Structures are given as C-alpha cells and as structure tokens.
C-alpha cells in the first residue's frame, strides 16, 4: 500500500501518507480554542501522522464563519498550546492554517462594522451565502478595495500570527491561499480588477501571496511554512482566465523564495478542482477531466519540494495518486470528519462511517464532532 | 405528486409532466437513424408521455458531432418513420428537435472540409473542445459569416426539415435555439458582432430566431412547433451582457408570432444554468439558487403558453417546479439516459441508476444505450 510507505517531509519522518486536511468546524466558541478541539484532534492523531488545523484567524477582522479559532491574542495561544500538546503526546506533526477570508465576511463578523477588505470592490455574487451565527444563511456585503499601504498591515498580521503559532508549539503554519479567500482574491483575475502594482499582469497578481510567504519565512524559517492554493476552483466567484499560467507563476515564485532562503518550504498543498460544471450541456465536459489532470501534474513537476493533493480523494484515488507519482501526501477532509481512525481504517480497508453534513458547522463539542465511532 | 397531474399541451392530453429532454447520443451511424434508436426511444416512451428527440440535422452543414441523425433526406425520413411508429404504439407524443450547430463544428464534419457557418467570423475559444470521429477532442476553427441571402437559405432548411418531420409522423418539431449553437450565435451579444439588420440591437439579434420560427409555423402550424432557448447558459462562449433582457426580448417575439398567427406554439422550453454545490469546499453547500429561479420564473410569467423547464432537475425539484407554478412540464436528460423507466421510478420514488458519461457519445447500439436496467 503506497499510502503506508514512509515519507520524509523536511525534518518530519512521517509513517504514512494520509493527512488530516484543514477543516472549519465552528467549535471554537467565541474564537478561543476549546477542550473539545483537543479531543477531536487527539482522536485523529497517529504515530508519524500529519495534521493540519482548521483555518485560524490572523486578526479580529479576518473571519467569515462563527466560532472559528484565532491565534492573534495571547489567550488564544495559551489554549492552542494545550491542544498541540495532546497531539504531540500521540507522536503526530501538526501545522496551524492561517486564514483570512477577505470579502467573504459579514457585518456580524466585523467588530468595527467596517466593510470586509479585498483586492476589489466587487461583492461575491448572489448565488453564494455565508453561515450566520444562528445557523441561517446570509448575504455577502460589498467589500472595500484596500490601498497599497494597507497591504503591508495585513502581511504583518500573518507574520505575528505565524510567530504566535510557533509560541503555541505548532510544528509549522500553512498559508490558506486558496478557495477564493483573501489571498486568492488577489491571485485570480476574475476577482482582481486593480490597476496598481498588485493588479494586472500575472507577476503583479502574485505579489501579495509572495509577500505573505516571505514574511512568515523570514519570521519562522522556510521549513516551518506550508502553502495552500487552488488555481482552478469554483468557489466564491474565484475564476482565472488561465489557471495553468497562474499556478506556474505561484510555483515559480515559491521556488525562488526557496532558492534565496536556502531552505525548502514544508510543502505545496493544492486542491483538486474536480470540475463538474456544464454537465447538462452537449459539449461542456469534453476534455475537462484531462485538462484537470494536466494542471495538477504540471504544477507537481514544476514545484521543487513536497506536494500534497486534496479534494474528493478516496482510499482508491489516494493509492493511485501516490503510486503514479502525482503527489507525496494526500489530505482527506470529509472522510476524516466521520472516521477518527481513518488512517487505521484505510490500512485495514475497513468500512468507513458516513459523514453527517448537518453537523459539520454546529457548535456542539460532542455531537457530530467527537462521537463518530472507532473500529470496534 | 404534482408531476403526475395530467397536463393539456395544445391538443395533446399528457398523463404526466416528466419529459424526455433532447439528447445527442451519436448512434445514428452516418447520419441515418438506426434500429437502436427505435429500441432506445421505445424503452423510454410511456402512455401519455412526451419525448423530444436528440438534435437532428437540417442540412449537410448543420452537424458538429459524429453520427447524429438528419431529417433532410428522404432516406432519413423513412428510417425516422419506424422509430415514430414504435413510440406512438406505446401511446407517447414525440417531437423532433431541429439542430444547426453553426460555428460549433469542424472541417471533418463539413462537406468538402468547408468552414462552418455562423453570424460571425469569431471562433469558439480554446476553453471548449469538439468531439472528433475517432473519440479524441479537437479545436473549433474560424467560421464563415453568412449574408442575408444565405440566412434565408438556412431558414428554408429549417422549413424543409420541419415538413420532413411531419411526413415521418412526428407530432411536431422543436427549434434548438440554445446552448451557443447557430441561433444562439445570432441571439447572444457576446457572439454577434454584425452591423447589418441581424446585429446590434435586441430587435436585430432576435431577427434570425423570429425568421426561423415564422417559417416553420407557416409550414406546419404553430401548434406543432416548440422553441428551446437558454439566455443564461454561456456554453461555447455564448454569453450575453444582459441575459434576462435577452430572454424577455425573445419571449416578446414569440408572443407576437402567436398573436399574428392566431394560435399558440406547442411550448417554450428553457434550460437553466445549474451550479453543482461542491462538498469539498468551505461554502459550497451554502449556495442559493434563488437568482436563477427568479430568472426562469420571470421568463415563464412573460410567455403566453406552455413552459418546459430543464437543467439539473431531480424528482424533488421537478415536483416543486410544478407545485409552485414555475413550469408546466419538466424535462430530464442525464437521469433519462440511465433510467429507461424514469417516469415509473419517479412515480414510485424508487432508486435511480447512475449515468456513465463515458458512453454518452459512443457508437455501440447497446452498450451504454439500451442496456441500462429497468426496475426489477
Ligand atoms: C466542512 C469542511 C470544512 C473545511 N474547512 C477548510 C478550511 O478551513 N481551510 C481549507 O483550506 N480547506 C477547508 N476545507 C477543504 C478541505 O481542507 C479539503 O480540501 C476537502 O475536504 C478535501 O476533499 P474531501 O472532503 O473529499 O476529502 C473544508 C472542507 C469541509 C468539508
Ligand atoms: C449527453 C447529452 C446530450 C444532449 N444533447 C442535447 C441536444 O442534442 N439538444 C439539446 O437541446 N440539448 C441537449 N442536451 C441538454 C439536455 O437536453 C438537457 O437540457 C439537460 O440534459 C437537462 O439537465 P439534466 O441532465 O440534469 O436533466 C444534452 C445533454 C446531455 C447530457
């Protein structure tokens, strides 16, 4: 089983290739990590296994979901340390994902009633909604296109949060640069309509992620930094005219940060598009799944380092990704929600619990969170 | 179950509201309807049920898929008659969809390797592919822009094909005016860059569809003519700057044809964009379809007659569409591919077979065509 062949990720001797993908679950009441998160991550931790935490706030204004943890206050750092300790007790490696949602926010998640920040003034279109604290779905407001001088302040929020993650004992951080959130709002030319130095050419649109990555690398070292992107994705109106061109520009700048830093990053983490659009048309799907495979393998061959693939993976698709050399590590999300011992189950090819979508984002510290059964 | 309320479509007393949507399947080898088509439509026919055939060529220049049937020769009429006879023997109503692909073709599909015809010289871009006869995907080429006299010849091709369909025994015809094919290449201001009386204003862009519909109405009668459009679907680079305005402008012209002809069309058939809610993303399952639903309801409210909705419909969505008054009839494509007895399965709320996209457009007369199983 290729998934259980060991993998060296930097200084990390991983015993298997099954990774816990970062997943928002909204159990961090009032944005402070809770003991429930400890039991949750403890359940999924394995000897030599890699975990990535839920997206975590870098500033008071950076959230777009309820009860997501932060790591911008000293109190949050203190509570994360307790979670990290129990994961390390089980011998696992754990990175904290740093998450700014940008224009994907709401007045209820904005402490000063300010408009959410972004590259653009364009709002998320009406077919997307936000989760409200009462469980209802809300409308995304109009964001504010931030000026040049404001870029550095947000970059600084990543740096201070990265230092805070290290203070809490995390083995590293992951930059959430995917899925139409703040960093992806600069990357994608379907969102980024700016005319200043952060807009226009591929090089200009890549400046924000480059400056974010360089700041956290200069703060905690390249070996403790992973980066997540999704060049091709249908999420929150993030589309690009040439996803392949965009992906290789990001890879080329990441490769260059490694060259000048003299150390590789922890990894590149890329979401599988899993294109299913225009399925009701005559020609909309012709050659789509072939374009998608080419996208991923082209990025993988170009990136000089560890490659993690994510999105719609199953036990069979994960085996084949590693077997064909398509990725070094495979992260699982939904199956890891409902199977605390997904790693063991994948080893044994056991039956897999089915996830209950209804409790993905509810606030109960147990129900839908820690009461999915182990193998008996 | 509102889908099994009877519906009166003109003279036709339909016993239920589940419609077979028109679907290209490429089993009509060398453009001649085959016996396999008779078995396929017979499997799906029900007493009082309405069927619409796959897109059918109106001329040697109208195809952009391999082995699609024509109805522009007498040999084709004779073979279609056998299929119509077995469908009528089961008590179903059947219309033949008349299809010209315009610029969505390739030299391999054109007489003497000629360029495809269109409103414009602009090609479909390389984000779309054409299916080639050998099963690979090819590149759409530059079309030739036709002038006023040749437009009138294409209109006559529609008229002659409509007469041929009646000669074969069809209950009527459907004009394929959707999905970025020839008529939509005149409708959509993202495609139509003409400056003559067929380009520019909404009125000019609607001239071609009005001419086509008027010509067939005057040949066989409005009661035997249905019209299909998709103002909000941008398949094959067919975008309009104001889809709802374009949709209402088309509806206006159809209402006017009906008043001047003194009788209603069989129906207006509209395919709507349908956005798959991705489960792998943070907010994919929080989406809203309200905006697309309001577009469809506004077109239906504006049109004086029978409305067929299509695009991503399920059992539950079809029930809701009829129950809320949003449509009179609901057409199903992909689920009708894999469920020959889809009508009965929806009536009983039975499980549905999954369709296999790999055999949507292959040539076998059985495999992936007639060997999907009935309820047992
Ligand atoms: C409930 C849920 C929450 C998620 N939260 C995040 C997140 O906070 N940050 C992130 O980068 N991806 C997030 N994702 C995407 C996952 O990390 C992962 O890419 C996806 O679940 C993998 O596909 P799979 O569920 O088929 O395994 C989330 C996915 C789900 C289903
Ligand atoms: C394989 C396939 C072939 C199709 N061929 C045609 C066609 O020839 N003419 C047409 O107007 N629409 C065609 N369509 C679109 C369907 O008529 C219909 O609008 C769509 O399939 C409905 O969505 P559903 O599959 O979710 O039911 C086709 C769709 C598919 C999947």
Residue numbers in the entry:
A (entry chain A), B (entry chain B): 10 to 385
Q: What does the original paper state about this entry?
A:
Jasmonates are phytohormones that are pivotal in mediating plant responses to various biotic and abiotic stresses and regulating plant growth.
Variant Y364P was produced to test whether residue Y364 is required for homodimerization, as proposed previously. The slight difference between the dimers arises from the protomers being differently positioned to each other.
